[PDB]
Write a protein that holds these residues in place. Sequence first.
Motif, PDB file in Angstrom:
ATOM      1  N   UNK A  82       0.788  -1.221   0.000  1.00 42.88           N
ATOM      2  CA  UNK A  82       0.000   0.000   0.000  1.00 42.88           C
ATOM      3  C   UNK A  82       0.824   1.277   0.000  1.00 42.88           C
ATOM      4  N   UNK A 114     -14.783  -9.009   5.803  1.00 44.46           N
ATOM      5  CA  UNK A 114     -14.226  -8.935   7.150  1.00 44.46           C
ATOM      6  C   UNK A 114     -15.271  -9.205   8.219  1.00 44.46           C
ATOM      7  N   UNK A 174     -15.781 -12.947   8.253  1.00 34.70           N
ATOM      8  CA  UNK A 174     -14.624 -13.605   8.854  1.00 34.70           C
ATOM      9  C   UNK A 174     -14.581 -13.405  10.363  1.00 34.70           C
ATOM     10  N   UNK A 218      -8.718 -10.744  -1.900  1.00 37.57           N
ATOM     11  CA  UNK A 218      -8.167 -11.553  -0.824  1.00 37.57           C
ATOM     12  C   UNK A 218      -9.280 -12.353  -0.169  1.00 37.57           C
ATOM     13  N   UNK A 227      -8.632  -1.917   3.211  1.00 32.47           N
ATOM     14  CA  UNK A 227      -8.024  -0.589   3.104  1.00 32.47           C
ATOM     15  C   UNK A 227      -7.786  -0.189   1.654  1.00 32.47           C
ATOM     16  N   UNK A 228      -7.535  -1.153   0.767  1.00 32.24           N
ATOM     17  CA  UNK A 228      -7.334  -0.781  -0.630  1.00 32.24           C
ATOM     18  C   UNK A 228      -8.654  -0.631  -1.382  1.00 32.24           C
ATOM     19  N   UNK A 229      -9.669  -1.419  -1.030  1.00 35.03           N
ATOM     20  CA  UNK A 229     -10.961  -1.382  -1.700  1.00 35.03           C
ATOM     21  C   UNK A 229     -11.922  -0.363  -1.092  1.00 35.03           C
ATOM     22  N   UNK A 230     -11.405   0.658  -0.405  1.00 32.09           N
ATOM     23  CA  UNK A 230     -12.215   1.821  -0.054  1.00 32.09           C
ATOM     24  C   UNK A 230     -12.392   2.736  -1.255  1.00 32.09           C
ATOM     25  N   UNK A 231     -11.296   3.005  -1.965  1.00 35.33           N
ATOM     26  CA  UNK A 231     -11.304   3.900  -3.113  1.00 35.33           C
ATOM     27  C   UNK A 231     -12.120   3.301  -4.248  1.00 35.33           C
ATOM     28  N   UNK A 253      -2.848 -16.035   7.308  1.00 31.71           N
ATOM     29  CA  UNK A 253      -2.659 -14.643   6.894  1.00 31.71           C
ATOM     30  C   UNK A 253      -3.890 -14.064   6.226  1.00 31.71           C
ATOM     31  N   UNK A 254      -5.030 -14.745   6.350  1.00 31.85           N
ATOM     32  CA  UNK A 254      -6.222 -14.342   5.623  1.00 31.85           C
ATOM     33  C   UNK A 254      -6.892 -13.125   6.239  1.00 31.85           C
ATOM     34  N   UNK A 255      -6.864 -12.974   7.564  1.00 35.36           N
ATOM     35  CA  UNK A 255      -7.548 -11.822   8.143  1.00 35.36           C
ATOM     36  C   UNK A 255      -6.731 -10.543   8.009  1.00 35.36           C
ATOM     37  N   UNK A 256      -5.399 -10.631   8.045  1.00 29.19           N
ATOM     38  CA  UNK A 256      -4.583  -9.452   7.768  1.00 29.19           C
ATOM     39  C   UNK A 256      -4.708  -9.035   6.309  1.00 29.19           C
ATOM     40  N   UNK A 257      -4.737 -10.012   5.401  1.00 29.51           N
ATOM     41  CA  UNK A 257      -4.946  -9.715   3.990  1.00 29.51           C
ATOM     42  C   UNK A 257      -6.345  -9.180   3.727  1.00 29.51           C
ATOM     43  N   UNK A 258      -7.343  -9.628   4.491  1.00 30.96           N
ATOM     44  CA  UNK A 258      -8.691  -9.083   4.354  1.00 30.96           C
ATOM     45  C   UNK A 258      -8.757  -7.639   4.838  1.00 30.96           C
ATOM     46  N   UNK A 259      -8.082  -7.337   5.956  1.00 28.00           N
ATOM     47  CA  UNK A 259      -7.990  -5.960   6.441  1.00 28.00           C
ATOM     48  C   UNK A 259      -7.283  -5.069   5.429  1.00 28.00           C
ATOM     49  N   UNK A 260      -6.187  -5.565   4.857  1.00 24.33           N
ATOM     50  CA  UNK A 260      -5.407  -4.805   3.886  1.00 24.33           C
ATOM     51  C   UNK A 260      -6.184  -4.587   2.589  1.00 24.33           C
ATOM     52  N   UNK A 261      -6.919  -5.611   2.146  1.00 26.30           N
ATOM     53  CA  UNK A 261      -7.797  -5.483   0.989  1.00 26.30           C
ATOM     54  C   UNK A 261      -8.880  -4.449   1.240  1.00 26.30           C
ATOM     55  N   UNK A 317      -7.662  -2.944  -7.121  1.00 26.36           N
ATOM     56  CA  UNK A 317      -8.412  -3.788  -6.209  1.00 26.36           C
ATOM     57  C   UNK A 317      -7.508  -4.921  -5.760  1.00 26.36           C
ATOM     58  N   UNK A 318      -7.729  -5.395  -4.540  1.00 27.10           N
ATOM     59  CA  UNK A 318      -7.045  -6.570  -4.021  1.00 27.10           C
ATOM     60  C   UNK A 318      -8.107  -7.610  -3.711  1.00 27.10           C
ATOM     61  N   UNK A 333       0.457 -14.296  11.289  1.00 24.31           N
ATOM     62  CA  UNK A 333       0.746 -13.008  10.674  1.00 24.31           C
ATOM     63  C   UNK A 333      -0.367 -12.029  11.017  1.00 24.31           C
ATOM     64  N   UNK A 354     -20.566   0.872   5.805  1.00 23.25           N
ATOM     65  CA  UNK A 354     -20.199  -0.495   6.124  1.00 23.25           C
ATOM     66  C   UNK A 354     -19.964  -0.632   7.622  1.00 23.25           C
TER      67      UNK A 354
END
Lengths: 227, 111, 84, 150, 228, 224
Positions: free
Chosen positions: A180, F111, F114, E150, B82-86, B72-80, E147-148, C26, F63
């Motif tokens: 990011x 999220x 999950x 995940x 943050x990116x999929x806000x825009x 690592x799925x929940x950290x990647x979900x949080x990070x996604x 987009x990501x 992680x 959300x």
Amino acid sequence: YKKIVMSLPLNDRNRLKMITKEAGKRGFIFCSVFQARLNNIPKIPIVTNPESLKRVKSNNLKTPLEWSQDIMNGFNVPLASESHSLPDTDSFYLRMVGIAREHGLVGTVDARCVELISLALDQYLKNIIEFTIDTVRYRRKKYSDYSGLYKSVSEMAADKRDAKIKQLDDDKNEDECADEAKSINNGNNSSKDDIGDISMSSAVNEELHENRTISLTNEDIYDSLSI
Amino acid sequence: PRDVRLLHLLLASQSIHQYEDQVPLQLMDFAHRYTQGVLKDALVYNDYALGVEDIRLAIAARTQYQFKPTAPKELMLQLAAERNKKALPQVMGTWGVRLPPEKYCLTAKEW
Amino acid sequence: TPEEETTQVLNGVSRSFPLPLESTVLSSVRYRTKYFRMREMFASSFSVKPGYTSPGYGAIHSRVGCLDLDRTTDYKFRVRTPQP
Amino acid sequence: SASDLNRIVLEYLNKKGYHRTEAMLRAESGRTLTPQNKQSPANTKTGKFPEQSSIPPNPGKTAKPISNPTPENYIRAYSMLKNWVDSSLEIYKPELSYIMYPIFIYLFLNLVAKNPVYARRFFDRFSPDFKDFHGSEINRLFSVNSIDHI
Amino acid sequence: VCMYTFQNTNKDMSCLDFSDDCRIAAAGFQDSYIKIWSLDGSSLNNPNIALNNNDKDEDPTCKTLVGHSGTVYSTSFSPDNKYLLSGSEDKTVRLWSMDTHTALVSYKGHNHPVWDVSFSPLGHYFATASHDQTARLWSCDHIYPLRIFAGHLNDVDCVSFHPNGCYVFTGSSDKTCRMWDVSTGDSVRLFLGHTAPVISIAVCPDGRWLSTGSEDGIINVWDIGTGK
Amino acid sequence: RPKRLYNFVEDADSILKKYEQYLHSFEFHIYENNYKICAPAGLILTKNNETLKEFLEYVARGRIPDAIMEVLRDCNIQFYEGNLILQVYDHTNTVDVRPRVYRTLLKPNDLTTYYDMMSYADNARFSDSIYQQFESEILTLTKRNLSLSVPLNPYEHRDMLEETAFSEPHWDSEKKSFIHENYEQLMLIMNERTTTITNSTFAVSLTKNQFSRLKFIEQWRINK
């Protein structure tokens, strides 16, 4: 079956061992959802063991009503992403005592390991910043025994994040620096965390032209834009 | 060797029937180095305080920076999230492929 | 006979699966603290409506772990849940 | 262990706020197959091109797959016929060379009444091909750009 | 079926692709080249009437493209057929012009090797698969992703769009595949039932049925409405 | 073959319009310089802090925050098709005869599912594939409204289309071109409050070596 040539030159002790293994040797967990849950939850140390109860009652350490408050006060520290400055001694102390109550340590945190943590952060960030600095420039007077001023950008701290990738914690921080930190030119970075919405391009709604004054949800986001 | 044919049975247990010759040699020379480093760090951690929790400390010291991380799925979900806000930008409507601006392309460069 | 020995050896290798003794999940500092802070605000806000008991301890008021003072190397522990 | 999963699903819907009739109807909607769309690759009679409107896609404004059933400017609608008659030096070539002029003239005169800049595109796009066939009439049609210019 | 058999590749040719009009073939090698074949025996030099010089070089009707530093694991052609999109194990996806045979744009948003790049139906924006268990949506004018995707447990092997360019389909090595909303980013469908790494996925031109194949040699079809 | 004709809503405005004339889920209040997040019927009242300044970034983007899921399950509030209805009261712009009422909707994420599964993992102790099957079944039963219908592809019907609806490279002269883009702090130096003599004694001893009282008096009068 067909592996007579290979499963036979194993010795008799090895084969008598390997006709016995099974599933049910452990007491572990393997559900990754449950592992992430147990890494997420805050846990407080309790006591049931009588010898450890008399060991913790003798050294005047308290009941879990104080360790739960210490968990909460170690979490409520303004951690260093929000303050935009390196932390101080009281913030270090409160965060480390909250972490030590998370792991189980009901004792007291020493006052020199905080300064050790301080010098650790010093040399860690100095290593990272130095091996970002000597890549945008070739200091000719340095690195030798006989141009202007540069600012390091986030693309550079991604570019030497990978040319020297050993220098990191390899935790969340490097994942977010890889994922990011690079922004496309319509990213709208100098912002107030909310102005990248679509409705801030389409006209502030005015007020109170109604007897019951129930409004719409496109006005609530303009209401929350101001704060 | 016993572990070359034990690695043969291990590879065949996960349905790997075609491989080269130096692949169990590479697996054995990985396992030697990994166990030697783990036992050396565990001897350090036992001189500090062998046992199994000592081995657990010595293999949790180096899980943190080399192998595949856990759940690592929940950290990647949080990070996604943050990116999929825009919301997505405005696209061209001339049915083709549009390039970036000329300084962000590998063309205005020199040797 | 080598046939029953070979099939039981292949039965033994087909039943052994390793787990790791130490796996580091992680995660983050910041998402953990922000999860805790938002859960503390919305846990202190509303009520519980219990049958007999509410979850939480002093100044947590949510689902809190029950790690013991000993057995800190255990892989699982109990949590708090509102019991009727 | 699938009936227990069905019970977990029903209790999840009950706690996540679906009425009993609403959960029954969402289950019955989830069970039946996606029916047949007769315009499946969008056949070129009743099918349209996608819009080139410079916005990104959005899967909203859209009903469910379970329920049964399922402007176009003048330059492309003339270029279709233009390329179709241009791909032929056959026995039927000069009759299309005859009939290609007044359809262009009437499309231009029906498009100046609605959109002038699309009409200025449409006139100069297909201008220099039959100027030698139809004289200075297209030079006379230079000065038409509005309804009052007609 | 017309079969194109490539001869002198000593097991160092990864997955290839043909263009549309079938005039160009693109093959990614294990030694960081993209090899470009004119399938008609054409010149593939794009003179464009300039004719300046250089008949001294050797043109075997085949052009090589050297911009990667890792092994090229996937490659995708635009529907316009004028650009090529090559995904490698160095953590970039590069863009090539098929009429001057150079690189144009590097696309850096991954930290693991890239395994499946794929353009849109309308050629707007391309989706990417990688070892980091996430798919990423891109755009050909933006250097960094948009987009990501995940939510998978293992890494993503294959990627494909719906033929309208409005959903994304990703198959992964944990015996499942997913349908993603392209705007909100979150998964809309999860298809369970396989027993092996899903390796190739494709959705019918009707759009109501999804088909994919695993490494168990079993293809299967679901319908996207019911999901079963 | 479907048996009936179904009417399911997967928007924000349509779900809100369906669920007007219904009791709300939250109850948020904007007073002057302080806020309050209560229940529809000890409910806390906050100063301008940073947890609320991040919660407000999750209501201009409609959300639910991922942190709240389990405690919503604890607090017995009403969900509405996975969404919950935030009723905001702006008391600064009230009218006389009631404050300015807004009624927004917050939508579940990946999220939220999950974190709902992670909080299901407390007392259930399921494996991973049960969570996979549960998520697949719920993503089937709750995600209707799919846009699966293909238009014409403009690249095959090129002969029946305008010529400049596409953008290919062109060759210019000797090159080719693509398409791009102080004082108050001095006068209060020793102003540090002390609750009691015992606490002062402990504070000076260890350096060299809320309305709980009224609630206690009330509960002791109740116990008698």
